[PDB]
Write an enzyme that holds these catalytic residues in place. Structure first.
Site, mmCIF file in Angstrom:
data_model
loop_
_atom_site.group_PDB
_atom_site.id
_atom_site.type_symbol
_atom_site.label_atom_id
_atom_site.label_comp_id
_atom_site.label_asym_id
_atom_site.label_seq_id
_atom_site.Cartn_x
_atom_site.Cartn_y
_atom_site.Cartn_z
ATOM 1 N N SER A 31 43.443 52.075 45.656
ATOM 2 C CA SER A 31 43.181 51.675 44.596
ATOM 3 C C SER A 31 41.931 52.227 45.177
ATOM 4 O O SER A 31 40.786 52.907 44.278
ATOM 5 C CB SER A 31 42.681 50.370 43.888
ATOM 6 N N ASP A 68 33.492 24.356 45.001
ATOM 7 C CA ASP A 68 34.024 25.440 44.972
ATOM 8 C C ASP A 68 35.021 24.443 45.286
ATOM 9 O O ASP A 68 35.337 23.881 45.515
ATOM 10 C CB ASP A 68 33.026 26.680 45.800
ATOM 11 N N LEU A 128 26.777 28.582 47.637
ATOM 12 C CA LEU A 128 27.202 28.198 48.379
ATOM 13 C C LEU A 128 25.516 27.539 48.975
ATOM 14 O O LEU A 128 24.858 27.875 49.981
ATOM 15 C CB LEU A 128 28.835 27.663 49.699
ATOM 16 N N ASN A 166 46.614 51.391 38.954
ATOM 17 C CA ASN A 166 47.110 50.403 39.751
ATOM 18 C C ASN A 166 46.420 49.612 40.257
ATOM 19 O O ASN A 166 46.887 48.061 40.684
ATOM 20 C CB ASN A 166 46.613 51.843 41.509
ATOM 21 N N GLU A 211 32.671 35.077 36.671
ATOM 22 C CA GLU A 211 32.391 33.525 37.453
ATOM 23 C C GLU A 211 31.672 32.151 36.694
ATOM 24 O O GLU A 211 32.990 31.217 36.723
ATOM 25 C CB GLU A 211 31.299 34.033 38.429
ATOM 26 N N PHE A 242 32.188 39.652 45.157
ATOM 27 C CA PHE A 242 31.742 38.740 44.780
ATOM 28 C C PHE A 242 33.308 37.133 44.440
ATOM 29 O O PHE A 242 33.343 35.627 44.745
ATOM 30 C CB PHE A 242 31.346 37.768 43.133
#
Ligand SMILES: Cc1nc2n(c(=O)c1CCN1CCC(c3noc4cc(F)ccc34)CC1)CCCC2
Ligand SMILES: CCCCCCCC/C=C\CCCCCCCC(=O)O
Ligand SMILES: CCCCCCCC/C=C\CCCCCCCC(=O)O
Ligand SMILES: CCCCCCCC/C=C\CCCCCCCC(=O)O
Length: 423
Positions: A300, A203, A215, A315, A194, A287
């Site tokens: 999955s 963001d 945030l 997958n 990230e 996340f």
């Protein structure tokens, strides 16, 4: 009798299983570790129970009475206490060696450390049991030492409860370190994926955030976004924060993400099934995509739930997520498949530390009912069914044959080693 035959069969199982443990470590490369050398020391402690103690115990069942002499009784009790204290002091040394492997960063320095630990185990077991040969240095002149009212207190506290507490404190200290690692590994996993931002920024949805996806507020005023930041960091951050201050905020977001994952009916099942390492990869996805988006990988997620690590990877590479952020996706899909931190830094010792704690726990499971019974003899003077007292004693001696059975189950190297010796 019938119970004497079972005891002799137990003697064979104790010897058969523990002779394997010695030869296997002695001849297998991947089994020649510090812990495994303390494991064969543990196997010798049990091998001596079968040979120096159990013959007295099986004799004790056939005869139906303690028809020794007073010196034969003292010798037996001394050896019985010693060879069982060595088992406890070995499990203590194993935990300590397990602590140094996890908490601390040599082929020569380590071997010297094992030699010192083993010597202390057996010299201490001797010095603890040596008083039993001499009336426990107390007032029991013309009788066996097991007739001394202070023998129960001695062998319980010194030989069992004190090793119990110390080993328990070590494993608690071990768990605390491993949990700090998982909280640290996940922070690094996401500052790679990230990104760690130390000053306030917007963001992709316009909200003011900071750290690793945190945030501050959904309000448009920048001055208000700084008010929530300082109310959480504690200081007048003025917009910039430490990487450490951001790591505290990240842990809060991670814990918050788990409260929702478990409250999400579509993500809680797979989350339970997952290993702790693969569990971080799922936290990485929520996340990035939120709990809504991750719950869309139904085909999955069921494969992660069914341990189908191979297909669950194949997958997940066919999704619009793998096509939008492919570098991060391949790193997370690798974590879902391998179950380690190869993509980001993975400790290969945890599997050995988990087995060491399972052996120590099974030990406590086997002997604790025996020492619980002692507490009852003192408390209410209620004579306890001698078939029960005899059972909890045999159950403790049974512990000498369960450890080799555990190495075949939880350790692939031990299991394949035994099968090569029997072929
Ligand atoms: C033979 C016998 N037979 C009977 N009873 C007995 O207590 C006994 C003796 C049982 N030994 C078990 C191990 C004990 C011990 N010492 O130190 C330790 C350290 C450890 F980590 C774990 C265990 C021990 C010492 C007593 C009770 C009545 C029924 C017949
Ligand atoms: C020499 C190399 C070792 C490097 C790691 C250190 C090993 C352990 C060091 C000290 C052990 C502390 C002594 C234990 C005392 C326990 C006594 C008790 O609590 O009853
Ligand atoms: C003597 C050995 C006692 C060791 C006590 C067992 C340690 C706790 C086990 C566990 O953490 O699950
Ligand atoms: C009383 C204290 C007993 C010692 C318990 C803590 C030992 C854990 C660390 C041991 C070590 O790493 O050397």
């Amino acid at each position: 009798n019938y119970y004497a035959t079972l005891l002799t069969l137990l003697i064979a199982v104790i010897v058969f299983g523990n002779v394997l443990v010695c030869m296997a470590v002695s001849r297998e490369k991947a089994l020649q570790t510090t812990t495994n050398y303390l494991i064969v020391s543990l196997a010798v402690a049990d091998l001596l129970v079968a040979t120096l103690v159990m013959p007295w115990v099986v004799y004790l069942e056939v005869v139906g009475e303690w028809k020794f002499s007073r010196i034969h009784c003292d010798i037996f009790v001394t050896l019985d206490v010693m060879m069982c204290t060595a088992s406890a002091l070995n499990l203590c040394a194993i935990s300590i060696d397990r602590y140094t492997a996890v908490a601390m960063p040599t082929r020569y320095s380590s071997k010297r450390r094992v030699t010192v630990m083993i010597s202390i185990v057996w010299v201490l077991s001797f010095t603890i049991s040596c008083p039993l040969l001499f009336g426990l240095n107390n007032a029991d002149q013309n009788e066996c030492i097991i007739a001394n009212p202070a023998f129960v207190v001695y062998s319980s506290i010194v030989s069992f409860y004190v090793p119990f507490i110390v080993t328990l404190l070590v494993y608690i200290k071990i768990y605390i370190v491993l949990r700090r690692r998982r909280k640290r590994n996940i922070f690094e996993m996401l500052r790679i994926d990230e990104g760690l931002r130390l000053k306030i920024y917007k963001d992709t949805e316009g909200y003011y955030t900071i750290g690793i996806g945190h945030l501050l507020t959904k309000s448009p005023s920048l001055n208000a976004a700084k008010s929530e930041l300082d109310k959480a960091i504690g200081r007048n951050t003025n917009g910039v924060i430490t990487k450490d201050e951001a790591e505290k905020l990240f842990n809060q977001d991670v814990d918050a993400a788990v409260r929702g994952i478990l409250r999400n009916a579509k993500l809680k099942p797979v989350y339970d099934s997952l290993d702790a390492v693969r569990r971080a990869a799922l936290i990485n996805m929520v996340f990035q995509m939120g709990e809504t988006g991750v719950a869309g990988f139904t085909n999955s997620l069921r494969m992660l739930q069914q341990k189908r690590w191979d297909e669950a990877a194949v997958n997940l590479a066919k999704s619009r997520w793998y096509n939008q952020t492919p570098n991060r996706a391949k790193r997370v899909i690798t974590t879902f498949r391998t179950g380690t931190w190869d993509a980001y830094s993975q400790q290969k010792e945890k599997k050995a530390t988990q087995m060491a704690a399972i052996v120590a726990g099974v030990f406590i499971i086997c002997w604790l009912p025996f020492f619980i019974t002692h507490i009852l003899n003192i408390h209410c003077d209620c004579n306890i069914p001698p078939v029960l007292y005899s059972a909890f004693t045999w159950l403790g001696y049974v512990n000498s044959a369960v450890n080799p059975i555990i190495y075949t189950t939880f350790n692939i190297e031990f299991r394949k080693a035994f099968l090569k010796i029997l072929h």
